[PDB]
Structures are given as C-alpha cells and as structure tokens.
Amino acid sequence: KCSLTGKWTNNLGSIMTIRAVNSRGEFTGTYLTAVAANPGNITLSPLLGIQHKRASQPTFGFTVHWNFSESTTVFTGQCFIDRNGKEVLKTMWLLRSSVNDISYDWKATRVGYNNFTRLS
Amino acid sequence: KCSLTGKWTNNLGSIMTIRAVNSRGEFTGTYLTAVAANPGNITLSPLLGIQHKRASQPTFGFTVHWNFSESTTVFTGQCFIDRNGKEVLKTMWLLRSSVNDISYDWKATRVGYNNFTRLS
Amino acid sequence: KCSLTGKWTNNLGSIMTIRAVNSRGEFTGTYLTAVAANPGNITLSPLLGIQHKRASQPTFGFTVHWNFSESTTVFTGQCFIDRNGKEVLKTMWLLRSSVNDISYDWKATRVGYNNFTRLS
Amino acid sequence: KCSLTGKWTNNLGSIMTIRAVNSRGEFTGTYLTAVAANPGNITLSPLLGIQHKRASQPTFGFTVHWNFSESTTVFTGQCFIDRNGKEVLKTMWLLRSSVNDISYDWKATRVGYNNFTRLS
C-alpha cells in the first residue's frame, strides 16, 4: 500500500514533505520547489490534498499555494508500487499564473509532469 | 475582493458549494458533477483547496475526491471581478483515472476547462 | 460530413482559413491570432494538419508555426454537427515557447481551449 | 543545430521516422506507437508537422492521424542539444478521442509527455 505521508523528491530536484493522511484521505504538507519564474526568491509553500484510502495504488490530488508569488499549482497522479516495494508518484500538474484581467486568461496556465520518489 | 465561499455552477451544469475560506486561504466544500464516466453512479463528493488571500482576483486550486470512482480531479484558476462586480472563475482541470499498473500510466490523465459563475 | 475547409473564428476572436482537405485528410491554411505574448508583433501564420476522412464528426489536429515568434501551437479536437447542421470545432491546444536550455523546459508549455464556428 | 529529420524513439518505446524538413520547416513522417487503447490492432500512422528553421534549438509541432482508431494526437516541444552534441526532443501531447456528440466532449482529451532520443 501507498501512503503519501513522508518525504519525496521529483525529477526537477524539488522536495516535498507530507504529514499523516487522515481517515478521509486528506493531507497537508510543505513543498520546496527547485524551479520558479524567479529562483532567487523561493520559499517553502504549503500544500493541501486528498488521496483515495482503500486502493493499494491510490490516485490523489493536491494544491500548492506558492508563498513567494501569486501563482498556484495543482498536481494529480497515482502512487505505484513495483515488485521490490518501491513507490513512485506519477503526476501531471497545472501551474496557474495571476493575470490582470479576464482577457489575458488564455495564457495563464502551464502544464507539465513530475515523477516523485521517496527520500531514503 | 473574490472569496470562493458560496455556491457556483459551471458550463457543464455542475454545482459546487465552498465553505468558509480560512486565514491561510484554505477551503473545503462539496462538488456535484453533472458529468462522469458512469453518470448513474454520481454522488456528492468532497473538495479541498487553497486560494490566495491578499489579491483582489486570486488564483486558487482544489482537489475533488470522487466518492463514486477511483479517480481524482484537480482544478486551478483565477477569480475575476468585472466592472459590474460580477465574479467568474476561469479554470482548467486534470482528471486522473486509476490504472492497474504503471505501464498504463500514459493514458490516465484527461484535461479540460470550466467556467464558473455564482448560483445567485 | 464535417470538412475543415473554410473560414472559422474562435471564442478569443482569432480567425483561420483552411484550404482543401486532401484524400489523406491533410490540410493547410492560415491563422490570424487575436492574442499573443506581444500582440504588436502579430502576423498571419501558416498551419498544417490532418483530419479523419470517413467519420461524419472527425477528430483532427494541426500545428501553427507563429511567423512572429519562436513559439509553436498545436490544436486537436473534433468537428461536431448539431441537429440543425451547424458545425462546431471543440479544441484543446498546447503553446510551446522557446527556452534557452533544457533546465527551463519545465515552464515552456501552456494549455488551453478554443471553440470555433464558421465565419459564414 | 537540431533537425527533426531521422529516426527517434521515446520513453514509452514508440518509434517515429521523419523525412526531410523543407524550407518552410514542414515535415512528414511515420509513427509506430508502442501504446494505444488496444495494442493488438496497432498500425503505422502518418504524421505531419512544422518546425522553426533558423533556431539552433527549434520548437515544433506535429499531428499523428492514427490509422487504427478515430483518434488524433498532437505533439509540441523543443529540440535541445547538450555539450556532447546529443539531441533530445522534449514534448507534451494531447490525445483526442472521438466521442458521439458534443455533450461528451469534456472527456475526450488526454494529456501527457514524451522525451525522444535519436536511434543510432
């Protein structure tokens, strides 16, 4: 089985720490991105999400409120376990930037992927 | 200022109800989707997310844990206020399906948009 | 049957003109975007794509090579015919920006939607 | 400099062959996917796209008309060269499925990534 609780890194070098997942699958944590619009100002940012509880390889989602910009990122994906018991989070994300008014909305959303593995 | 608290409907007919937004911008609520893979199964499902607090037109994200499938959806977007004071949520979403193993991961994520306005 | 040949406009005000669709479903045309990173620079830009041929409501894709930037956009979607014979193209797109090197790749892709209807 | 001409594989084991890129950056090719909705019926499928010509690390897009389903995929990305002269295509894609009518459009588009390297 695949809890999101613990410490993770991704293919870009970011790290995230997730606290205990509650009975509803809800979790909180802290995200340190290796990458931003401007790296010189990166600070720790809170995350909040929900995973499925019963599934051995659950799907999940979470939101990161960036504490150093007006942007928000959401991640969704699935936790997989291989034959050796090794976990990987396979995720896709959307990064929403703040734009001035609705006529700029079209350009406000970036998309990408991330693969996370457990630290230690 | 744009607070996500309240009831909203989107362009597909779905309805969501967001409760109080806390000091950190965290919020919970429920989501009744008009659409699903198997609509006969649809039930009210919980959401959890974070919005920015200081901005008049905040970005935000939330996760919906579907209570009737193994899937998860994340939404991110921005709340805009027009010159008449009307609020629109412009969002993009990712819908993560559960797949049996990692070899099927490539096909597990759908993408789309939704525009939300207030029920009343 | 839905042939992409003709002039179309989208929900952002952009206009495109598609030429004859060949036996394979290949088509070329031009795209005049209403929106860009630097709108002062916008010029008419070429597109090239393929639609399915046998289907009444074909899926399709096309690439727009922006003639005024280093970016590229791809659109994919489906042409629907409603009960009155009116055609709508429902599309999603990815806009790829040029970045200086691979360390910036993560932020180079935007996503969005567009709905197109015929000019006349 | 980064021509798309040649033979490529991606992280899912798919292979594609691209013919000579013309003076406008247009190219044709053939795509053999390792993965589909149903693999037992996979056949070679044509692709058609445009790359930028002047840039050393050009952006590009192309469309794959699947010859064994009603779907279409578009890819966009950038060709990067490292210090050793090794090329990688970093791409994102949208896979459009055919749905019966416009009320099902919401679920019709999958998103993902692929990294391609040159064969040989």
From Swiss-Prot, chains A, B, C, D:
Keyword terms, alphabetized: Biotin, Disulfide bond, Glycoprotein, Secreted, Signal
Disulfide bonds: 2-79
Localization annotation: Secreted
Residues glycosylated per entry: 41, 67, 115
Molecular-function GO terms, alphabetical: biotin binding
Keyword Transcription regulation in record: no
An annotated GO cellular component: extracellular region
Record: residues binding biotin: 10, 14, 31, 33, 37, 69, 114
Sequence ranges assigned to domain Avidin-like in this UniProt record: 1-120
Keyword Signal: yes
Top-level taxon of the source organism: Eukaryota
Similarity comment: family membership: Belongs to the avidin/streptavidin family.
Function: Forms a strong non-covalent specific complex with biotin.
Note: The sequences of the coding regions of genes AVR4 and AVR5 are identical.
Assembly description: Homotetramer.
Name assigned to this protein: Avidin-related protein 4/5
Provenance organism: Gallus gallus
Full-sequence range covered: 27 to 146 of 150
